[PDB]
């Protein structure tokens, strides 16, 4: 299927973060986000480990699961910020974090932020010298932003 | 195996549905956060489920050989000829060889021949699938827990 980039890929710490969008989708189970006909698009964070990910045990290019991802969407010039939790899921092209999204201020230019929290107590690290890793997860969320995304309506 | 330390197989690697399941064990480890399993000095070994997608995994969007996250894994440890069952919840975690499900384990029944079962529950509400025709997948998660069994695992103490 056809994917449209929100911006250029961005590296942040051990992560490579891409944002794309395309037509809204049907999810099973439904999750938190709007149903397909209630939404403008599907939005996704493709989050993989870059070369620095080996400090935490990740292979380069691998998906990084158990993160907590949400998008902050703000029309440029506006005070209102829309927040959308993303969920981990598979499409036909593989795992990603995503949600169906309705742009609540309609057509126009937006600032799009992906807030990426580390796993927390869900996920452990081996830290012994024999089997463990010396990298560590980040305390405050990684925030990746694209500044002048133009929502121009259904391009599909 | 792991390029940076010594893993020992529990038995043959098995296929079950879209999953390729391998069981290994090695010296007990330190985890951060500590999680629910025993501390390094109190345990016999670390026990790990290596769960990846086989070729059938593409029906769910997985790439072949990719780690399968968000599963709920627990181990049932039963000495052959005994009625007592030890149950060990695994947690997701990273070692130097990457993500896996594991726990430190102390074999409560001592050295001997054990039946080892890994029961693997699907993600449920923790992982979604696209099911529309344009972007979605054709397969669905299993509803009944997958069970991978090794009937003659010999625990003979540390191998390290
Ligand atoms: Cu999605
Ligand atoms: Cu482990
Ligand atoms: Fe995608
Ligand atoms: Fe391993």
UniProtKB/TrEMBL annotation, chain A:
<feature type="binding site">
    <location>
        <position position="126"/>
    </location>
    <ligand>
        <name>Cu(2+)</name>
    </ligand>
</feature>
<feature type="binding site">
    <location>
        <position position="89"/>
    </location>
    <ligand>
        <name>Cu(2+)</name>
    </ligand>
</feature>
<dbReference type="GO" id="GO:0046872">
    <property type="term" value="F:metal ion binding"/>
</dbReference>
<keyword id="KW-0732">Signal</keyword>
<keyword id="KW-0479">Metal-binding</keyword>
<feature type="binding site">
    <location>
        <position position="96"/>
    </location>
    <ligand>
        <name>Cu(2+)</name>
    </ligand>
</feature>
<protein>
    <submittedName>
        <fullName>Pathogen-specific surface antigen, putative</fullName>
    </submittedName>
</protein>
<feature type="binding site">
    <location>
        <position position="44"/>
    </location>
    <ligand>
        <name>Fe(3+)</name>
    </ligand>
</feature>
<feature type="binding site">
    <location>
        <position position="3"/>
    </location>
    <ligand>
        <name>Fe(3+)</name>
    </ligand>
</feature>
<feature type="binding site">
    <location>
        <position position="93"/>
    </location>
    <ligand>
        <name>Fe(3+)</name>
    </ligand>
</feature>
<feature type="binding site">
    <location>
        <position position="42"/>
    </location>
    <ligand>
        <name>Cu(2+)</name>
    </ligand>
</feature>
<comment type="similarity">
    <text>Belongs to the UPF0423 family.</text>
</comment>
<feature type="binding site">
    <location>
        <position position="46"/>
    </location>
    <ligand>
        <name>Fe(3+)</name>
    </ligand>
</feature>
């Amino acid at each position: 299927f056809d994917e449209f980039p929100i911006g250029d890929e961005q590296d942040a710490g051990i992560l490579t973060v891409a944002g794309v969008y395309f037509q809204p989708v049907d999810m099973e189970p439904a999750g938190n986000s709007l149903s397909k006909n209630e939404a403008d698009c599907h939005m996704e964070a493709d989050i993989s480990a870059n070369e620095k990910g080996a400090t935490l045990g990740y292979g380069a290019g691998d998906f990084v699961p158990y993160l907590h991802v949400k998008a902050y969407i703000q029309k440029v010039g506006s005070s209102k910020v829309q927040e959308v939790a993303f969920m981990p899921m598979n499409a036909s092209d593989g795992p990603h974090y995503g949600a169906n999204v309705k742009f609540e201020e309609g057509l126009g230019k937006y600032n799009i932020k992906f807030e990426i929290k580390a796993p927390g107590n869900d996920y452990l690290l081996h830290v012994d010298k024999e089997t463990g890793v010396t990298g560590r997860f980040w305390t405050e969320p990684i925030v990746v932003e694209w500044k002048d995304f133009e929502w121009t309506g259904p391009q599909w």
